[PDB]
Amino acid sequence: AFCKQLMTLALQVPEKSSQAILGLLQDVVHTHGRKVAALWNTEERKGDGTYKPLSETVEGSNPFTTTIWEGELLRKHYCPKVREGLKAMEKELRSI
Amino acid sequence: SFADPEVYMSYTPR
Amino acid sequence: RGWAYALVRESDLPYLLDLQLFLGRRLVLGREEKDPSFARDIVVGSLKRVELENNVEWVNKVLHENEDIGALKRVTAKAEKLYMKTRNPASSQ
Amino acid sequence: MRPLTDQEMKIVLDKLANYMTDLKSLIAPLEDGDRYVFRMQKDRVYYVKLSIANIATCVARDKLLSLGTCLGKMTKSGKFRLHITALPILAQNARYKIWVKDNGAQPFLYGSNIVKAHVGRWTEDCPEHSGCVVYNMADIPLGFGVTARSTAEARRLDPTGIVCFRQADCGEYLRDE
Amino acid sequence: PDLQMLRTRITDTIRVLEDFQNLAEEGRSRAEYTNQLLKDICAYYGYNEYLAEKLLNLFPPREAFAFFEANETPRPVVIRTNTLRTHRRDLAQALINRGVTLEPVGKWSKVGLQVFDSKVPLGATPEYLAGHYILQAASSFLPVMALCPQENERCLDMAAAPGGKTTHMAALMKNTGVIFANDPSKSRAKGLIGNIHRLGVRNTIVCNYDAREFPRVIGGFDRVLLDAPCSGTGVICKDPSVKTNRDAKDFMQLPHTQKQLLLAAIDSCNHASKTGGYIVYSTCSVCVEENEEVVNYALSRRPNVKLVETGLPFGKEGFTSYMGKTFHPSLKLTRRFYPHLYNVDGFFVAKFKKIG
Amino acid sequence: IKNKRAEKAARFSVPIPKVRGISEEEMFKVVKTGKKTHKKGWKRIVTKPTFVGPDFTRRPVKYERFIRPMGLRYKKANVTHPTLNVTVQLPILSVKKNPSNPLYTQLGVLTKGTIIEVNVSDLGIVTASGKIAWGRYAQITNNPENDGCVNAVLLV
RNA sequence: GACCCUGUUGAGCUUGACUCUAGUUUGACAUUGUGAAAAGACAUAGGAGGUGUAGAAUAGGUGGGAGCUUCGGCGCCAGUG
RNA sequence: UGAAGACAUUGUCAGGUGGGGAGUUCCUUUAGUCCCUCGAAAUUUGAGGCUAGAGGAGAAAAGUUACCACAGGGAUAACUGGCUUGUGGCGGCCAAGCGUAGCGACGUCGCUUUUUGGAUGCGGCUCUUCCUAUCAUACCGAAGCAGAAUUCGGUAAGCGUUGGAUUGUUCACCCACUAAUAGGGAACGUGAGCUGGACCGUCGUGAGACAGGUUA
- Interface residue ranges in chain D relative to chain A, Cβ cutoff 8 Å: 22, 25, 28, 30-31, 92-93
- State the nearest Cα–Cα gap between B12 and chain F, in angstroms: 8
Instruction: Please name every residue paired with F151 in a beta bridge, in sequence order, or none if there are none.
Output: F78
8 A C-beta contact, residue A21 and residue A13: yes
> How many Å from the CA of D55 to C1' of H21?
22
Q: Which of F136, F64, F124 is nearest to F94 (CA)?
A: F136
Q: Is the CB of E147 under 7 A from strand G?
A: no
Residue D170 CB-half CA count within 13 A: 28
Report the C-alpha gap between E196 and E165 in whole angstroms: 11
**Longest CA–CA separation in chain E, Å:** 71
If residue F153 lies in a helix (H) or strand (E), which one and from where to where? Answer: strand F151-154
The alpha carbon of D136 is separated from its chain's Cα centroid by a whole number of angstroms, namely: 16
Instruction: Say whether A50 and E89 touch across the interface (CB within 8 A).
Output: no
- Top residue of F4, F58, F131 to mutate, by most chain E CBs within 10 Å, is F131
Return d(Cα E45, Cα E353) in angstroms, integer.
Answer: 41
Distance, CA of D85 to CA of E199 (rounded, Å): 10
Using DSSP bridges, classify how beta strands F66-67 and F44-45 pair: parallel, antiparallel or unpaired. Answer: parallel
**What is the dihedral angle through the alpha carbons of E15, E17, E23, E24, rounded to the nearest 10 degrees?**
140
If you measure CA to CA, which chain B residue comes closest to F15?
Answer: B11
**C27 sits in which H/E element:** strand C27-29
Render D74-94 in DSSP notation, one character per residue. Answer: E-TTS-EEE-TTTHHHHHHTB
Q: Are F120 and F154 in contact (CB under 8 A)?
A: yes
Q: Residue E95 in contact with residue E102, Cβ under 8 Å?
A: yes
Amino acid identity of residue E242, one-letter, is V
Identify the chains in contact with A, defined as 3+ C-beta pairs within 8 A: D, E
Q: Which residue of chain F has the CA closest to D164?
A: F34
The residue among D42, D55, D51 whose CA lies nearest residue D2 is D42
**Which chains lie within 8 Å of chain B at 3 or more CB pairs, if any?**
E, F
Candidates F151, F127, F119, F154; CA nearest to F138 is F154
Number of H helices, E strands in chain C: 3, 2
> Beta E133-136 vs E77-81: how paired, if at all?
antiparallel
* Calpha distance E154→E141 (Å, rounded): 20
Chain D window 55-94, residues with Cβ within 7 A of nucleic strand H: 57-61, 72, 79-83
Helix axes E248-268, E288-301, angle to 10 degrees: 40
- Per DSSP, which regions of F15-150 are E strands? 44-45, 66-67, 76-81, 86-97, 114-118, 136-140
Rg (C-alpha) for chain D, rounded Å, is 18
- E267 carries a ligand binding annotation: no
Residues making up chain D, counted from first to last: 177
C42/C29 Cα distance (integer angstroms): 8
Q: What is the C-alpha radius of gyration for chain B, rounded to an integer number of angstroms?
A: 8
The type of residue at C46 is S
CB of E219 under 7 A from strand G? yes
**E strands, chain D, in order:** 2-3, 36-41, 44-49, 66-67, 69-74, 80-82, 96-100, 114-115, 119-121, 131-136, 141-147, 162-169
Residue D171 CA to residue D143 CA, distance in Å, equals 10
Residue E219's identity, in one-letter code, is G
Distance CA E132, CA E267 (A): 36
E strand or H helix at C44: strand C42-44
For residue F14, CA distances in Å to E104, E126, E342 come to 20, 28, 16
Do residues F142 and F151 touch, judged by C-beta distance below 8 A? yes
- Cβ–Cβ under 8 Å, residues D116 and D137: no
- Considering only the beta carbons, identify the residue of E62, E101, E106 that sits closest to B9: E106
Residue D167: nearest nucleotide (C-alpha to C1')? H206
* Closest C-alpha among D173, D154, D156 to residue D113: D154
Helix (H, G, I), strand (E, B) or coil at D96: strand
**If DSSP codes are grouped into helix, strand and coil, which group holds residue F112?**
coil
Catalytic (active site) residue E230? no
Question: Can you tell me the distance from the alpha carbon of A45 to that of E216, in angstroms, rounded to the nearest whole number?
Answer: 40
Element (H, E) at C50: helix C49-65
Q: How was this structure determined?
A: cryo-EM
d(CA D25, CA A33): 28
| Residues of A (2-31) whose Cβ lies below 8 Å from D | none
Q: Which residue(s) pair with F56 in the sheet?
A: none
Contact between B13 and E342 using a beta-carbon 8 Å cutoff: no
Nearest to residue E285, comparing CAs of E217, E223, E346, E212? E346
Q: Which of E42, E230, E284, E287 is catalytic?
A: E284
Length of chain F, in residues: 156
DSSP F50: B
- Per DSSP, the three-state class of A80 is helix
Smallest Cα–Cα separation from F139: which of F120, F107, F117?
A: F117
Could you give the CA distance from residue E337 to residue E310 in angstroms, rounded to a whole number? 13
Q: Is E163 annotated as a binding residue?
A: yes
Give me the sheet containing D44-49, strands edge to edge. D2-3, D36-41, D44-49, D69-74, D80-82
HEC letters along chain B: CCCCCCCCCCCCCC
Q: Which amino acid is at A12?
A: Q
As a whole number of Å, the CA-based R_g of chain E is 22
The CA-CA-CA angle for residues A90, A92, A93, to 5°, reads 60
* Biggest alpha carbon–alpha carbon distance for chain F: 61
CA–CA gap between residue D175 and residue C83 (Å, rounded): 48
Q: Is the CB of E321 under 7 A from strand G?
A: yes
Helix axes E164-173, E186-199, angle to 10 degrees: 30
HEC string of chain E?
Answer: CCHHHHHHHHHHHHHHHHCCCCCCCCCCCHHHHHHHHHHHHHHHHCCCHHHHHHHHHHCCHHHHHHHHHHHHCCCCEEEEECCCCCCHHHHHHHHHHHCEEEEECCCCCCCEEEEEEECCCCCCCHHHHHCCEEEECHHHHHHHHHCCCCCCCEEEECCCCCCHHHHHHHHHHCCCCEEEEECCCHHHHHHHHHHHHHHCCCCEEEECCCCCCHHHHCCCECEEEEEECCCCCCCCCCCHHHHCCCCHHHHHHHHHHHHHHHHHHHHHECCCCCCCCEEEEEECCCCHHHHHHHHHHHHHHCCCEEECCCCCCCCEECCCECCCCECCHHHHHCEECCCCCCCCCCCEEEEEEECC
Spell E248-260 as b/e; 16+ CB within 10 A means b: eebbeebbebbbe
Contact C84, C11 (CB under 8 A): yes
Q: Give the side-chain half-sphere CA count within 13 A for F124.
A: 8
Burial label, A12 (beta-carbon count in 10 A; 0-12, 13-18, 19+): exposed
Q: E74 and F16 in contact by Cβ < 8 A? A: yes
Half-sphere exposure in the Cβ direction for A25 (13 Å, CA)? 32
Relative orientation angle of helices E61-72 and E3-18, to the nearest 10 degrees? 150
Secondary structure class of D24 (helix, strand, coil): coil
Residues of chain F contacting D110 with CB distance shorter than 8 Å: 27, 30-31, 58
Q: State the DSSP code for C83.
A: H
- Can you say whether the dihedral through the CA atoms of D15, D18, D20, D23 is positive or negative? positive
Side chain identity at E211, as an amino acid letter? A
In DSSP terms, D44 is beta-bridged to D41, D73
Chain F residue nearest residue B11, CA to CA: F15
| Sign of the torsion formed by the C-alpha atoms of F118, F120, F125 and F127 | positive
